[PDB]
Design a protein around this ligand. Sequence first.
Ligand SMILES: [Zn+2]
Ligand SMILES: [Zn+2]
Ligand SMILES: [Zn+2]
Ligand SMILES: [Zn+2]
Lengths: 151, 147, 129, 77, 76
Amino acid sequence: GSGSMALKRIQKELSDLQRDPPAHCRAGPVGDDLFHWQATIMGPPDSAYQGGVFFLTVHFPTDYPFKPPKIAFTTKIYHPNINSNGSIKLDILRSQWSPALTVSKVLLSICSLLCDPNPDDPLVPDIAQIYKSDKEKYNRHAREWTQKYAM
Amino acid sequence: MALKRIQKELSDLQRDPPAHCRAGPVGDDLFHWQATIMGPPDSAYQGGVFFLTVHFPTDYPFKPPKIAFTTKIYHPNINSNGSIKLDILRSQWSPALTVSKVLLSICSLLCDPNPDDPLVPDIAQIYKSDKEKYNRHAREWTQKYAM
Amino acid sequence: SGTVSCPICMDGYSEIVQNGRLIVSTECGHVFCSQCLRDSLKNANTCPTCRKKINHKRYHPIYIGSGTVSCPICMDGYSEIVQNGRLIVSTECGHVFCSQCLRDSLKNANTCPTCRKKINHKRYHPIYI
Amino acid sequence: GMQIFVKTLTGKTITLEVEPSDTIENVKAKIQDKEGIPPDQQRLIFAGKQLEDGRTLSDYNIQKESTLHLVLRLRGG
Amino acid sequence: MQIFVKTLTGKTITLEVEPSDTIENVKAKIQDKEGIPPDQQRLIFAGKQLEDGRTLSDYNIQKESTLHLVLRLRGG
Ligand SMILES: [Zn+2]
Ligand SMILES: [Zn+2]
Ligand SMILES: [Zn+2]
Ligand SMILES: [Zn+2]
C-alpha cells in the first residue's frame, strides 16, 4: 500500500523489543502512533556520561525502512557531533544508512558514538576544540552536563 | 556417506510410500535392493508388475545405482537380459536423483521409447514399421511375464 | 520449504555447519553443502538440480542465521515471501533478502544492505530453497 | 481457478494455481519460478507417463488436486 | 573460551577465542560466519566500540561475554 510495509516492520521491531528487551535502551510509541517513538539511552559505564539517562525522539518516514529514521536527542548532552537542538550528525542516519539496521542497533550505535566522537568534521566546533585541546576539560564538561540534565 | 544417504532414502520411502513403485533392501544389505514397477494404465503394459534389482555402488550418490529388470519386457531400450540403456543411469546421472525418482523415470520410459538409438534394433524396427504389431507384442509379453 | 538442507547428503542446516562445512549456492540458485557440491564438481561440471554448467567457481557461500530463512529488511518469513510471488535472493556476497526489498534498497544505494559491498542488478540471483 | 500439487525433485510438494486450459509448458513455467529448473530439464509424470509440452491439463484428465511428479529430463538409448 | 556475538539481525553466534586474541582476529572469525568484512564491522561492548589493535584481555571481555555487532559508522 503506502506506509503499510513500514507499519508492519515497525510493529515487528516493537514486538522484538518488548519480547527481548536490550540492556542499552528502551523505546516505543508516543501515543497510538507507531511512526512516532520516544526512546531512552543509558550513558556508557566508565565514561563522562555514566549514570545518565538520555531521552530521544524517533520519527519513522513513510518509506521506512528504505529511508532512515529521524532521531534527535531531547536531553541536552555535551558532544562534538550532537548540537543544542539535539541533532545528531551521524553518517548511518544519512548517506551510510542501511535498511538492514533496526532502531535498536541504531540506538546502540548512537551510545557507541558518545565515547567515540569525531572532532575533525564536527557539528559543534567549540566542543571539538575543547576535545582536541584539553580532554580533561572536555570530560569534566560532559560529566557536569550529564549530572545537570541527564540525572 | 553412501550408507547414510541410502538409509535416509529408505526411511523416506518407509515414511511416505510411493504409488508407482515399491523399493527396499533384499536382506539386511542396504546396498542391494529389490524394486517393482506397475505398467502404466492405458498402455500395452497395463496390468503388468515388473521386478527390478538396484545395486548401489560404494561411492553412491556420486556414481549412479545399477538398475536392471528381472521381469522380461518388450521395449527397444531394455534388452532380454533386463539391461536398461538410459542416460540418467550413465552420463546424465545426477546425485540429486533418488532411487524413487529413478524408478518413476524408468516407468516413464516404458511408453516413451527411443527407437532411433535403440538397445534392441529388431524391436525398434517393429516400433517404427508397425506400431500395432509392436503394441501387440508388448501386450502379449506383459501377459506372458508380468502378470 | 522448512529448514534449508542439502539435497545430496540430506543433512539440515545445523548438522552442516556443526561439522565445518558451508552452505553454498550455485549461480542458478540451487543450494548444497560445500562438501557435496565439491564432490559433485569432481564427477561432472553441471548443477545436480538443474544441469546448468557451474564450472569455474559459479557458486558461492550463503550466510543464513537460523536454518529458517527470512528477509532482514521487510522481516517476512519464507512462506510470506513466496506466497506473495516474491523470490528469495542472494547477493554474490552471500546475503539473503526477498527480491522486492533488495530492488528497492538498490534504488537508494548501490551497496549490499548487510555488508555494504558494491552490488547491482547483475550481482544477485534467486535461490530456490 | 483450481490447485494441483507437484512433487518436486526433493520429494516436497508445491501447490500450483492453474486452469484446465493451461498448457504443459505453462505449468513448467510456473515450476521454474518456484524450483529454478528450466522447462527443457523438467519431465512431468502423471499416471506413469510423461506430459508433452503442447498438450493441456484437460487433455491428460488432470483435475483439482491431482499430483504431478517431477523428474529430470531423460532419453532412452 | 567462548564468547557470544549478537549479529545484525539480533541472532546470537558463538566464537572460539583466547584472551590474547586481537579485535581484528575476532572480526576475522565473524566474517567467516556472517560474511561481513572486518572494516564494516563495529563491535560494541559495555556501550563502547572495540578498537582493532587491542585484545579481548584489554577490554575485560571474558568467558561468555556478549559482543554486539553493528555496521561501521562515523560521527560528523
Ligand atoms: Zn551435502
Ligand atoms: Zn542449478
Ligand atoms: Zn523483504
Ligand atoms: Zn553483502
